[PDB]
Ligand binder design. Structure first.
Ligand SMILES: OC[C@H]1O[C@@H](O[C@H]2[C@H](O)[C@H](O)[C@H](O[C@H]3[C@H](O)[C@H](O)[C@H](O[C@H]4[C@H](O)[C@H](O)[C@H](O[C@H]5[C@H](O)[C@H](O)[C@H](O[C@H]6[C@H](O)[C@H](O)[C@H](O[C@H]7[C@H](O)[C@H](O)[C@H](O)O[C@@H]7CO)O[C@@H]6CO)O[C@@H]5CO)O[C@@H]4CO)O[C@@H]3CO)O[C@@H]2CO)[C@@H](O)[C@@H](O)[C@@H]1O
Ligand SMILES: [Ca+2]
Ligand SMILES: [Ca+2]
Length: 302
């Protein structure tokens, strides 16, 4: 038995040890020059980074050599690597958005560089791959993309984002999760909820996470916020506490470089200059410094 995989609703390393993501998102595709971000993120205690890629539909395609380099750099910094295609974001509502099938073709094109990296790399098929229009339409192409990647021979653990821009507020991923999970013959599939202003009360967070846990289905919070936006105030204190209580993975949005800097954890990619949001995530109660454990595949650091 090798590779990251799912068993009993838990993400396990090849050696069977439970792995709970404690990390952040890094916007690699828009910031190719910010090479030190991965080392900086590791130094602040993260055990996982979610790396923003483009499949070229909307932004500039990250080619195989670039992706190979990203994977190697994650391994060099003793980080588990969640790769994700951002171009799918908001499909049906964002005009520029790409399809999950287009993302799937891109992943298949990367299989030579993904090969042998199942201990380190999780494939998040497409970011937030449906908007708020007809979110029930998300299920069929998500299932099709899962089946297509498995048919192509991809063995990595998969990660699945929800419609309603990843916040699933109409409950489609929650309702249809069992059918999506069953589309993966290997069972190595994670669901990912994104929590922004929909998740502005503790009960919304607890009930959502517990719905997956109580169903036996694996869930991570693959992107989440904290500072208020135009739709409300995300309750990040409950996100962090509930994720620790249930020992579910989380990945804060984002290291640095947002067009609106309100969600930058670090200001200007400087790890010593954390925003209030960055301080909360890295140094606060139930945060990364407190609760992140390195993946055991890397061994005991000298
Ligand atoms: O130009 C040269 C320059 O380029 C630079 O690169 C730039 C890139 O080209 C690109 O423009 C990039 O843009 C980024 C941006 O910087 C951010 O990083 C952004 O991060 C997102 C991320 O995806 C998060 O996961 C999350 O995603 C958000 C969406 O962004 C969006 O806000 C959406 O909103 C939903 C919401 O989720 C909810 O459903 C709500 O429902 C409402 C509903 O509308 C009703 O009101 C109802 O009553 O209530 C419900 C419930 O509230 O609807 C809204 C939609 O209307 O939410 C999702 C999460 O759910 O947020 C992050 C912040 O947005 O991604 C962008 C790309 O997608 O920026 C680059 C930097 O500028 C560099 O290369 C530079 O060097 C170069 O010079
Ligand atoms: Ca709410
Ligand atoms: Ca908040």
């Amino acid at each position: 038995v090798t590779g990251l995989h799912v068993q009993g609703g838990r993400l396990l390393e090849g050696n069977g040890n439970d792995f709970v993501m404690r990390g952040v998102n890094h916007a690699h595709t828009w910031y190719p020059g910010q090479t030190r971000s991965l080392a900086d993120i590791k130094a602040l205690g993260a055990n996982t980074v979610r790396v923003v890629l483009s499949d070229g539909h909307r932004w500039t395609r990250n080619g195989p050599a670039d992706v190979a380099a990203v994977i190697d750099r994650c391994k060099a910094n003793r980080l588990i690597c969640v790769l994700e295609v951002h171009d799918t974001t908001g499909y049906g509502e964002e005009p520029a958005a790409g399809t999950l099938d287009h993302a799937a073709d891109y992943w298949i094109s990367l299989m030579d560089v993904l090969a042998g990296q199942e201990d380190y790399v999780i494939v998040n098929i497409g970011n937030e791959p449906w908007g708020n229009t007809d979110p029930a339409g998300w299920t069929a192409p998500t299932i099709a993309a899962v089946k297509k990647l498995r048919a192509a021979g991809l063995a990595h653990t998969l990660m699945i984002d929800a419609p309603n821009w990843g916040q699933d507020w109409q409950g489609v991923m929650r309702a249809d999760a069992r059918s999506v999970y069953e589309a993966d013959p290997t069972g190595n599939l994670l669901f990912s909820i994104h929590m922004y202003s929909v998740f502005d009360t503790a009960a919304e967070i607890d009930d959502y996470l517990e719905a997956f846990v109580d169903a036996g289905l694996p869930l991570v919070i693959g992107a989440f916020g904290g500072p208020p936006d135009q739709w409300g105030d995300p309750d990040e204190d409950t996100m962090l506490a509930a994720a620790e209580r249930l020992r579910l993975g989380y990945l804060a949005w984002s290291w640095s470089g947002n067009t609106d800097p309100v969600l930058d954890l670090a200001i200007g990619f400087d790890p010593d200059r954390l925003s209030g949001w960055g301080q909360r995530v890295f140094h606060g109660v139930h945060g990364i410094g407190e609760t992140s454990r390195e993946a055991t595949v890397f061994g005991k650091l000298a």
